């Protein structure tokens with residue numbers, strides 16, 4: 397629930413986008 | 415063969431509901447063959463509740479329509495007994 | 505190897521229209537969407553998170569061959585209409601133990617509907633919330649992170665202040681596993697007091713008999729609804745309230761319809777009992793004539809012996825919303841009142857203060873004090889929600 401927490405999930409997302 | 419059919423309305427608020435409806439109908443059909451020896455078969459089914467159709471099939475036009483009427487008469491009378499509202503649709 | 509169990513929790517899916525709620529649900533359950541989907545939830549004890557969480561008996565999705573551990577079965581609430589969803593939670597027709605607020609990273613936050621949805625969850629006290637930033641695939645990380653800060657900024661100072669935010673791509677099914685992990689963390693199943701009297705709101709009623717069915721094969725009417733509390737079982741004697749409208753000359757009244765439960769089913773699975781959670785299909789002994797074409801919609805069901813007030817007139821401690829999904833309520837006015845799954849018109853007798861009286865055209869069953877009701881008024885020919893309240897017995 398922290399920004400850093402949110403950001404890591406955000407990086408994980410783009411890293412799988414085609 | 416001859417086919418006489420009737421159209422009716424059937425409903426009940428009885429707790430046993432649908433099971434009460436079946437009880438009334440079978441009681442109305444009991445021994446109908448012994449009264450009209452020319453009958454081959456009878457079918458009572460729903461065509462969209464509360465509406466049902468009663469089709470009487472036999473080899474004698476007169477006996478068939480008499481049986482149809484006796485079945486309908488039995489249904490209304492016995493239904494009033496078991497709180498099952500049954501009437502003929504015009 | 506997973507067991508077949510009824511859903512044990514209800515999760516509402518809200519957010520402005522077109523933001524991805526249905527796709528999201530489909531990405532989670534694999535089901536397309538009152539929309540309603542169910543799904544089992546498991547976890548690969550060997551693997552690492554979020555990937556360890558799955559929706560089916562397989563750990564291959566994260567590099568493992570162990571049987572995943574079954575956690576629970578959940579169901580989701582998703583409607584196509586914006587106002588239906590608003591009416592749903594504001595009236596309490598559908599039980600919600602938690603919610604997922606969907607936000608499209610695409611457009612600006614918060615949109616109009618997304619706004620009303622947040623005030624609603626606050627109104628009905630649904631604490632367990634997860635804000636899902638969707639469609640991140642069509643925005644730059646700079647943009648994604650920006651809105652994040654806007655959202656956190658919006659939740660600041662509110663009950664949703666510490667609510668988690670998960671970015672996913674419903675469309676490409678990315679980070680759906682992180683969302684599942686989120687659900688298990690933030691939307692835990694509530695404790696259920698199974699000793700409360702059984703109460704089920706009727707949302708659907710059918711006659712499943714195909715035309716031409718021989719009388720001996722006739723099946724009892726089917727009721728579809730959501731169990732609010734208690735435990736229903738096959739063979740229990742129950743009653744439908746208010747029941748059957750009866751006219752005896754000048755007097756019109758409503759009579760409870762007594763019946764029995766012949767079967768209990770969730771999806772294509774049958775059970776001997778049902779607790780709160782998910783949407784249930786109940787078979788009964790009722791004359792199909794009474795259930796056909798959702799004729800019992802708006803009724804409630806409880807044990808034949810439950811003592812339930814059925815009243816024509818009610819008192820409602822109310823509150824008006826800031827917008828129409830807002831002039832004060834005045835006497836002699838006819839409003840639409842939604843209690844549970846029922847909707848009834850009624851005229852206002854008195855209007856003193858934060859309280860009103862209503863003469864209902866049709867009576868309603870109040871299985872408990874202070875049940876929620878939505879208040880709507882006819883604007884330009886169509887009824888619109890303008891407030892909410894609690895019925896006081």
Ligand SMILES: Nc1nc2c(ncn2[C@@H]2O[C@H](COP(=O)(O)OP(=O)(O)O)[C@@H](O)[C@H]2O)c(=O)[nH]1
Nearest residue numbers: 521522523524525526527638639642673674675
């Ligand atoms: N780019 C993108 N489009 C999405 C995503 N999820 C849904 N959509 C699209 O956005 C539109 C609205 O989605 P829909 O699921 O019907 O959401 P609803 O209107 O909120 O219930 C559809 O055209 C989808 O194809 C997502 O994660 N990314």
Ligand SMILES: [Mg+2]
Nearest residue numbers: 525526583584
């Ligand atoms: Mg949709």
